[PDB]
Amino acid sequence: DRNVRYARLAGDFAASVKAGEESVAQVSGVREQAILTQAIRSELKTQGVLGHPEVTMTALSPVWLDSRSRYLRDMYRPGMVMEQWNPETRSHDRYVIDRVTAQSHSLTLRDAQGETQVVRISSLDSSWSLFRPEKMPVADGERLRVTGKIPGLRVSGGDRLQVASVSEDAMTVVVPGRAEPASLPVSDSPFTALKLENGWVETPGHSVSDSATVFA
Ligand SMILES: [Mg+2]
Ligand SMILES: [Mg+2]
Ligand SMILES: [Mg+2]
Ligand SMILES: [Mg+2]
C-alpha cells in the first residue's frame, strides 16, 4: 500500500538527513512528489530535524513555455503570474493574469499598483515568463530549491537553501558560499513571492526508475 511504503521511505530518508549523510528522494510524477514530500516533512519533525511550527508563504514555480506552446491560449490561466524582462532598468516587471479572452486571444494583466493593460497573446516572445503562485509551509530546518533569481542573493535556479529560522516576519537562510545567514521576506502576495519551492524530493522526469525511491 502507498501510504505504508511512503511512511517507510520517509523514515529512511529522515534518519539519513539527521545523520548528516547524503540522501536523495525520487518519484515519477508531481502528485507523488507532493505526497512523499508530506510524509518526509512529518517524519523529519518526529525525528527532530525540522521544527514543528510552520509558516505559510506564497512562492512561485516556473511553467515552461517555448516557441511551440507560447501562443496557445489555455497555457494561460487567471491568477498565474507573468514577468516581462525590461532591457532598461535590467528588471523583471511582474503581473497577475486577471483575464484570458478567447475571442480576441488576449490577456488582461494587473500590476502591483493595480494598473491593468491588455496584451495580445501574439506579442509574447521569449522576454516573458509564466509562474504558478503556490502556498507552501516552511519550518525551521527546511530544505528549499531555488527556481529563479532571488532579490539580494547571488543564487540561481537549481541551488539549495537551508532555512535556519522562520517566523511570520522573515525567513533566514544559509546560502552556500555566503558567510552570514541572509534574511528573506515571508510573502503573502504573488507580487512579493520568491522563486522557491520545497527541496526535499527531486523534481520528476529523468529518474533512476518509476518507483518512489530513497537513496540513503
Ligand atoms: Mg516579510
Ligand atoms: Mg516568502
Ligand atoms: Mg516566497
Ligand atoms: Mg525570487
Author numbering: 575 to 790
From the reporting publication:
In the paradigm F and related R1 plasmid systems the 192 kDA protein TraI is the substrate of the T4SS encoded by the tra genes (Everett and Willetts, 1980; Reygers et al., 1991; Lang et al., 2010; Dostal et al., 2011). This bifunctional protein includes both the relaxase activity and a helicase that assists unwinding of the T-strand. A second group, which includes TraI, have larger, internally positioned signals. These regions of TraI, called translocation signals (TS) A (530–816) and B (1255–1564), target the relaxosome to the secretion machinery (Lang et al., 2010). In this study we report the crystal structure of the TSA domain of the TraI protein from the R1 plasmid.
Analysis of the protein crystals on an SDS-PAGE indicated that, in fact, an even smaller fragment had crystallized, TSAcryst: N-terminal sequencing of the crystallized fragment showed the fragment to start at residue 570. No attempt was made to characterize the C-terminal sequence of the crystallized fragment. This fragment of TSA crystallized in the space group P41212 with one molecule in the asymmetric unit. The structure was solved using the single wavelength anomalous dispersion phasing method (Rice et al., 2000) from a SelenoMethionine (SeMet)-substituted variant of TSA (TSA contains six methionines), and refined to a final resolution of 1.85 Å. A model was built between residues 575 and 786. The crystal structure of the TSA domain of the R1 plasmid is composed of three structural domains named ‘2A, 2B and 2B-like’ for reasons that are explained below. Domain 2B is made of sequences inserted within domain 2A, while domain 2B-like is made of sequences inserted within domain 2B. A structural homology search using the DALI server was performed which resulted in the identification of domain 2 of SF1B helicases as TSA's closest structural homologue: the RecD subunit of the RecBCD helicase ranked first with a Z-score of 8.9 (a highly significant score), followed by other SF1B helicase structures. Thus, due to the high structural homology between TSA and SF1B helicase subdomains, we can conclude that TSA is part of a helicase structure, its two first domains, 2A and 2B matching parts of the structure of the 2A and 2B domains of SF1B helicases. Thus the 2B-like domain of TraI constitutes a previously uncharacterized addition to the helicase fold, which here serves as a signal recognition surface linked to substrate transport. Five mutations resulted in significant loss of translocation activity: A593V, D714N, Q736N, S739A and S739N, indicating that four residues, 593, 714, 736 and 739 play an important role as recognition surfaces for substrate export.
